[PDB]
Symmetry: C3
Subunit: 259 residues, 3 copies
């Protein structure tokens, strides 16, 4: 039974499902290796249009595997383990397709980090979020990096030092997720978001996501120089040329994308 399931539809939409349900999908070394391999392969495939990051069992993800970690009390071990995790997280952010977290239960510590690194997230009303490493004496330093780029400073600091859960409604308000729905509506809500993305041209979405994360962490003038260069290249893409033509000619664009 694989630690990470992988399914693909006829639209280029890939679902990766964390699959250690009894372990609450904890990010063991082997889980991390599977995620790294999957995102590494998907990054080379221009036909991939979106990834849904889902999870088995009651939890979304409990974070690092504490059993496995505690068995290896070595500074070098932890240095490289955390670097490996960071490599998976940056691979999510570098994938040239949007990655959507499907959060149906608890997301704690590196599990909450996963949600914060995904480009988009849809949660159920009963899902709960925490950076709760501190409850075991391990401040959530790496999850805090991702969290403090989705929520305000005081909200992040409070979460980090107390380790307490935040509701899905509150997480949406804070900026950690995009949508909150009933459990029965979760698949429909994910599909609504996927269908909107896949209807757009791949080139535009890929160029745009890459530019988004380059520009967001620089000064506004540098950001605009990159953005303008990018948007000029995007406009010379055939789907932009066709998309603008179709608008002017009051018709649907012939993008050959799933509708």
């Amino acid at each position: 039974e694989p630690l990470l399931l992988q399914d693909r539809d006829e639209r280029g939409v890939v679902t990766l499902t964390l699959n250690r349900p009894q372990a609450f999908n904890a990010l063991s070394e082997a889980m991390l290796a599977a995620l790294g391999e999957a995102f590494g392969t998907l990054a080379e495939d221009e036909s991939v249009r979106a990834v849904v990051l889902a999870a088995s069992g009651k939890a979304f993800c409990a974070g690092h595997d504490l059993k496995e970690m505690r068995a290896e009390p070595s500074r070098e071990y932890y240095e490289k383990l955390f670097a490996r995790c960071t490599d998976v997280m940056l691979a999510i952010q570098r994938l040239p397709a949007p990655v959507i977290a499907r959060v149906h239960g608890i997301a704690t510590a590196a599990g909450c980090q996963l949600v914060a690194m995904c480009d988009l997230a849809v949660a159920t009303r009963d899902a709960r979020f925490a950076v709760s490493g501190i409850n075991v004496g391990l401040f959530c330093s790496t999850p805090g990096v991702a969290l403090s780029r989705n929520v305000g400073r005081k909200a992040a600091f409070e979460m980090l030092v107390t380790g307490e859960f935040v509701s899905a409604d509150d997480a949406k308000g804070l900026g950690l997720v995009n949508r909150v729905v009933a459990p029965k509506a979760l698949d429909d809500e994910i599909e609504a978001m996927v269908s909107k993305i896949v209807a757009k041209p791949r080139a535009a979405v890929a160029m745009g996501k890459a530019l988004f994360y380059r520009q967001i962490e620089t000064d506004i003038e540098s950001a605009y120089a990159d953005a303008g260069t990018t948007m000029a290249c995007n406009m010379m893409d055939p789907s932009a040329l066709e998309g603008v033509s179709a608008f002017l000619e009051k018709r649907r664009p012939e993008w050959h994308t799933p509708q």
Copy 2:
């Protein structure tokens, strides 16, 4: 009829009105040139106290002029066009008076960018905001620069990749506008904001706006060094000396500003 109307009251409040109502005030080359010249002229006039950026017809601004843009495509043409737009946007942010967007209808793509670049914005409840370039196959890279400096990452990414409208009240929640009112109340709401700004000394407002955007882009220690120097300079301005004396003597400050 001029592409851009310009009116000024006796308080030093300038209203610039986008005036291509049937084209939904699209930012053609000529509209951009007109905006560039207006902001250029205003930047040299220390008597200007505030600018209201308004718009004619049913829309606020549809963004770039797609008919014009599409006619003769080349990488160089788009690079230059987008740089010219960026120059207008940065001129708004660098103007030594606050610029308030008056948004009474749709603001899409570079039209949403304009709102995001203005220091302040008041919208009507029926105004809608989108970064909808993606709907014509052109990811909103340049509007995304501005948008991602007003709203959270996940909210910005969702807007950019889907191109969907956000309501005025949703936009206020997110940080893209300051105030949302009924259509009949828009002028009154603008006036309340303008009246508060013009009552304050020009010097303090000018020094303060400039510092605001320098400091927000650097580290907190560097920010404080610049802010302290700026505030010390401001304190030596006659209106600061008088405003503080007035507080201490329990009277109104003699600033000779509109009341």
Copy 3:
């Protein structure tokens, strides 16, 4: 009475109380010197677990002392005064224990800056917040540094150019405070927060706060490099090894907290 009261409980929780109640706790030169001295001494003491920044009288803090400032104006004096304020504000953010603002009344100008510089804040439902220097012709340039790192750009700009008050509930929504409660519930809400912090290992909280503010101001890859090595160091601390073992053995950790 002293300008700044300082009390400490048996848990290493230190309460600093601004104590110029009739002057609305304004940050005179002497007040700033007292704050600087207290944060300097506290930074050297690894037994301190948390600091509550409280205030006497009706107001939290009105900001700089306008009477004192106005007396002998010079550019050089204002630059030095504002740099002394900044040194206190940065001392707060660099202290190896969380600093919680207990806001029971108005916080204006450098007083609102104080709130924004504290790691956490609990306000009463009638506390009000403004960056109101502009009402005396002095744009809140230094308060805006702190405010713009707690609230959105347009919200911050509007506060700065108009000088108007924002309610406690609105401040919470914006990100300027964590919790809003009735005045009678304030002490209980502060204690709820402090007790959560004290329950965690000091080492972890100290290294975590330091990492938090280093990483927040850099790019995501630099942030992760620093966070990874910091977290690896934390995991070798005996309290992390014990905290994890305790979770695994379904028992409370023996942290002597």
